[PDB]
Design a protein around this ligand. Sequence first.
Ligand SMILES: CCNC(=O)c1cc2c(N[C@H](c3ccnc(N)c3)C(C)C)ncnc2[nH]1
Length: 168
Amino acid sequence: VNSFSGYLKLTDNVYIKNADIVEEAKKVKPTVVVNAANVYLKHGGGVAGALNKATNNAMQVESDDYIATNGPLKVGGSCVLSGHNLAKHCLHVVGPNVNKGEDIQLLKSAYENFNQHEVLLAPLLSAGIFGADPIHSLRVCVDTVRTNVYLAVFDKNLYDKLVSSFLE
Ligand SMILES: CCNC(=O)c1cc2c(N[C@H](c3ccnc(N)c3)C(C)C)ncnc2[nH]1
């Protein structure tokens, strides 16, 4: 149903909220929820762990079947699979892990995948243990994504930092 509420409008197509992406998916019933994935779709930590646990492991079982038959994703790439109980579809997107020296230019490739979907619920890419500067990740989203993206950032201090920087 895509019923998003409580978001700040940053640009004509980019919105942000201090919220847990799992609770937003349960409330909003989005067509697409984005997962902050890794190349072998191992959903143990970060946003991926939160989304997988909220599907009671159904996302990991489906992801393992996909990897067995198709192999790993590329950094910057993506894959649409079921959204299970959280959304119609899950778009698994791999941003670069700059803590491991992956190419930060591939963060633009990662966000470019969102342009195939009219509206998405998403986390900020390459944050957490991937180590990209979060203000830079929001700027790449704003400059690359043309479709409607609703960003859920589940940390008040990071949300306030992002909003303050954007409004400068
Ligand atoms: C209680 C169950 N829910 C959660 O644990 C949870 C976590 C969470 C989240 N985390 C962000 C993140 C972590 C890793 N990689 C990223 N690309 C981003 C950080 C930057 C705040 N962002 C959005 N919603 C979220 N929900």
